[PDB]
Write a protein that holds these residues in place. Structure first.
Motif, PDB file in Angstrom:
ATOM      1  N   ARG A   1      -5.365  14.287 -14.204  1.00  0.00           N
ATOM      2  CA  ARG A   1      -6.525  14.295 -13.309  1.00  0.00           C
ATOM      3  C   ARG A   1      -6.170  14.543 -11.839  1.00  0.00           C
ATOM      4  NH1 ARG A   1     -11.547  15.261 -14.178  1.00  0.00           N
ATOM      5  NH2 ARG A   1     -12.716  13.309 -14.524  1.00  0.00           N
TER       6      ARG A   1
ATOM      7  N   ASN B   1     -15.895   8.380 -11.419  1.00  0.00           N
ATOM      8  CA  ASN B   1     -16.552   9.541 -12.006  1.00  0.00           C
ATOM      9  C   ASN B   1     -16.649   9.399 -13.516  1.00  0.00           C
ATOM     10  OD1 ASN B   1     -15.928  12.483 -13.385  1.00  0.00           O
ATOM     11  ND2 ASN B   1     -17.552  12.505 -11.839  1.00  0.00           N
TER      12      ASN B   1
ATOM     13  N   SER C   1     -20.040   9.847 -15.689  1.00  0.00           N
ATOM     14  CA  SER C   1     -20.179  11.154 -16.349  1.00  0.00           C
ATOM     15  C   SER C   1     -19.838  11.070 -17.840  1.00  0.00           C
ATOM     16  CB  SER C   1     -19.350  12.237 -15.618  1.00  0.00           C
ATOM     17  OG  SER C   1     -17.952  11.938 -15.633  1.00  0.00           O
TER      18      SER C   1
ATOM     19  N   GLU D   1     -20.400  13.967 -20.715  1.00  0.00           N
ATOM     20  CA  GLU D   1     -19.194  14.573 -21.276  1.00  0.00           C
ATOM     21  C   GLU D   1     -19.078  14.366 -22.785  1.00  0.00           C
ATOM     22  OE1 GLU D   1     -16.389  13.188 -18.405  1.00  0.00           O
ATOM     23  OE2 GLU D   1     -17.230  14.550 -16.883  1.00  0.00           O
TER      24      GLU D   1
HETATM   25 MG   LIG Z   1     -16.668  13.690 -15.014  1.00  0.00          MG
END
Ligand SMILES: [Mg+2]
Ligand SMILES: [Cl-]
Ligand SMILES: [Cl-]
Ligand SMILES: [Mg+2]
Ligand SMILES: [Mg+2]
Ligand SMILES: [Mg+2]
Ligand SMILES: [Mg+2]
Ligand SMILES: [Mg+2]
Lengths: 293, 293
Positions: free
Chosen positions: A163, A206, A210, A214
């Protein structure tokens, strides 16, 4: 296992409580003039026009909110650099949301270069361009890659290592240092230490907000796929370990010089505040976050 | 706590057993011709001459051994890029060993750029130079920095995050990809994912064999300072934790494409073989590893 909905209120409350204790200083939102914001969106539309997909103003505003909330207004010195990060952030968000069939490097890389040459001096423009190029190339390369599966499914350590690049924080630092013109910050941006210090704080937040989108799209790049989110006990254990990760990083960020740590912490905390306010990070599929086909 | 000498034999044996099980392929030492070694050492002496300290041939050969052992000879395609890495590695080793009063950037940075322009094409030269500049600047900035104290004393995760840059592996990747001209490897070098995948395997090995020297010089950048090495039980539990880290990275490296993983694994395992036969990594202080004052 398809949703973190049951944990939404408590995890939001716990994130904020952690920031109030460990960061204290609240992030502040940049206000763009109407002139500034239409220049940003104009540049955004021009840059993605070659790829053939229309992006609505509401979608651009959803992408740009991250930049407005997560920079460090007290330290801003170059608003041309600031608008560049607005544009570069947004158009690479379109790319992140795109089916890789639409990824046309021959048409898109010149547009990224064009943005960098408009807003940056020649030196900074090459650094920002290289980082934008590396970001869109990595997102493309790793769609359905066995490397991504290995790094995302093995351990938190392997996942956050992926990441540093994939969430785009290295890119962010390398296009944002001209905003501040602060020598220490610039050096930490160019070694990527700046990015490595802020990766977990940005990514954990995040990922939580998300996750539902996802997993519905079959996207594996999300640390909460490392735990059984259907098991409240296992989930809360994992969530606490991730809070501990953020806390340790924040406490180490406080050894950096005052301006650098202000910016690093505005980034992590501002990203959290912008995320809780952003339509992108609520419904698993809506008209600002749906896959661009 | 001044020494890991009691663990020398069993730790060397355990490292080798780990590599035999998990990597299997043995590293290969590169032979340089006499003319090649002379070109490298001449270039090294010319580059450090402005800083005023003589460096013996035996000291250069101690420095260049890591490059000869840790590259990937079967995949080598550009021996000019190879010689560049020999020279750049060697002269920044001198910098690593110097008292920071000897760190003259105005004199040394132009010598680094001259090396890069002699051996690389224009694009490659800029990338290699930026990474050399970032490396020597970091080593200098962090001598007695509270940032370094924070990252080296808090946890293994903060420590290896610092070492991605500080041990020089990001620099190594960004000056070595031209040796191979392998598109995938070049992208992982430029995102620093290459360096992040190999940081722990290089660092844990280097830290074990440079501990006695570093502790004697008051140098804190060594992961075994995080455990009480005078406590045999605590040391062995910490050492097993570090072997587990190496093994996890190696198993994830195997997900990369065949040539990239060959290079990554040759780097980690070759660095170990080179380290065990290098005079630098024996005595705490000798005439190839003494501080340059
Ligand atoms: Mg994300
Ligand atoms: Cl994904
Ligand atoms: Cl040190
Ligand atoms: Mg993405
Ligand atoms: Mg995404
Ligand atoms: Mg060093
Ligand atoms: Mg050293
Ligand atoms: Mg060492």
């Amino acid at each position: 296992r398809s949703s973190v909905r049951p944990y939404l209120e408590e995890c939001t409350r716990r994130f904020q409580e952690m920031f109030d204790r460990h960061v204290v200083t609240r992030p502040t939102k940049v206000e763009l003039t109407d002139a500034e914001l239409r220049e940003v969106i104009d540049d955004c539309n021009a840059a993605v026009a070659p790829l053939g997909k229309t992006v609505s103003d509401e979608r651009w505003i959803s992408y740009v909110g991250v930049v407005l909330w997560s920079q460090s207004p007290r330290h801003i010195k170059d608003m041309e650099a600031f608008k560049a990060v607005c544009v570069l952030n947004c158009v690479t968000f379109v790319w992140d949301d795109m089916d890789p069939a639409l990824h046309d490097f021959g048409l898109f890389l010149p547009q990224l270069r064009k943005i960098c040459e408009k807003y940056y001096g020649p030196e900074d423009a090459e650094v920002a361009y290289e980082a934008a190029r590396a970001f869109v190339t990595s997102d493309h390369m790793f769609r359905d890659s066995p490397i991504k599966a290995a790094l995302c499914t093995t351990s938190p350590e392997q996942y956050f290592r992926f990441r540093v690049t994939d969430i785009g924080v290295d890119f962010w630092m390398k296009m944002s240092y001209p905003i501040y013109r602060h020598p220490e910050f610039t050096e930490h941006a160019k070694t990527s230490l700046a990015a490595r210090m802020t990766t977990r704080g940005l990514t954990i937040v995040n990922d939580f907000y998300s996750y539902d989108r996802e997993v519905s799209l079959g996207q594996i790049t999300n640390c909460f796929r490392l735990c059984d989110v259907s098991d409240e006990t296992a989930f809360k254990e994992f969530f606490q370990a991730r809070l501990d990760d953020m806390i340790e990083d924040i406490e180490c960020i406080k050894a950096f010089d005052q301006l650098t740590q202000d910016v690093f912490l505005d980034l992590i905390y501002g990203n959290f505040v912008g995320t809780t306010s952003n339509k992108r990070y609520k419904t698993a599929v809506n008209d600002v976050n749906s896959r661009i086909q």
